[PDB]
C-alpha cells in the first residue's frame, strides 16, 4: 500500500545506528514509534497527565488542611467554575488567590442561588384596550429593562454621556428624529 515512506524518510536522521543507516529497518521503527505516539496520545496520555494535576492542586490543598476530596466538591458548590488545570495554575503562581478560594469553600457563605427560569411579567396578562397610539404595556417595561442593562454594562462615556442623561428620556430617543 502506501507506507508514507516519503515523510518517514526524513525522520530517519534522528534514530540510532541501524535505523538511521538502512532505509527499510528505519521505517519499521519510525512507523512503530509514530504509531505509538498517536496510540498513547489519544488513549493513555490523558489519564496520566490528568492525575499529575489533581495531585498538584491536592498537595497544594493539604497545606491548608483540606484536600482534593473536599475541594472538588466545594469548588462546584460555590459555582466557582474553575478547570482543574486552573486550580493548579493558581496553587503555583498565585498562592494567595488559591488560599483565598480555600477560605471561601470553608466559609459558611451562601452559594449563589440557581439561575431563575423565565418569569412572565404581570403586564403580559393586563388587558390591552383598543388604543393604537400608545405602545403595549409590556414593551414600555421590557424596553426600560434593556436600556438600564445597556447603561449598567461598562463605563462607556456615551459621548461623555451625551445621550439622554436619564432613562425615561433615553426611551424617548424616537422623538429626537421627529419634526
Amino acid at each position: 500500500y502506501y507506507r508514507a515512506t516519503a515523510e518517514l524518510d526524513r525522520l530517519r536522521g534522528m534514530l540510532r545506528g541501524r535505523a538511521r543507516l538502512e532505509r527499510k529497518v528505519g521505517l519499521k521503527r519510525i512507523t512503530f514509534l509514530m504509531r505509538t505516539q498517536t496510540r498513547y496520545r489519544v488513549e493513555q496520555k490523558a489519564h496520566w497527565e490528568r492525575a499529575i494535576v489533581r495531585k498538584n492542586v491536592d498537595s497544594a490543598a493539604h497545606e491548608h488542611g483540606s484536600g482534593w476530596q473536599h475541594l472538588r466538591n466545594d469548588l462546584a458548590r460555590q459555582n466557582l467554575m474553575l478547570l482543574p488545570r486552573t486550580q493548579q495554575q493558581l496553587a503555583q503562581y498565585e498562592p494567595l488567590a488559591f488560599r483565598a478560594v480555600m477560605e471561601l469553600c470553608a466559609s459558611r457563605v451562601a452559594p449563589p442561588p440557581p439561575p431563575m427560569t423565565a418569569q412572565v411579567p404581570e403586564e403580559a396578562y393586563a388587558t390591552r384596550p383598543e388604543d393604537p397610539k400608545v405602545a403595549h404595556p409590556a414593551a414600555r417595561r421590557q424596553l426600560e429593562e434593556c436600556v438600564e442593562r445597556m447603561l449598567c454594562t461598562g463605563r462607556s462615556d456615551v459621548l461623555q454621556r451625551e445621550g439622554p442623561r436619564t432613562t425615561q428620556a433615553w426611551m424617548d430617543a424616537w422623538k429626537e428624529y421627529d419634526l
Binding site: 493513555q44 489519564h47 496520566w48 492525575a51 499529575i52 489533581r54 495531585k55 491536592d58 498537595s59 493539604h62 488542611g65 483540606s66 484536600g67 482534593w68 476530596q69 473536599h70
Partner: peptide, 18 residues
C-alpha cells in the same frame, strides 16, 4: 481499571483531620 497492568499514576492523599 484503565489498563489493569498496574496503576502507578499519582493518587490523591486522604484529607487531613478537621
Amino acid at each position: 481499571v484503565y489498563s489493569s497492568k498496574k496503576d502507578r499514576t499519582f493518587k490523591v492523599m486522604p484529607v487531613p483531620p478537621p
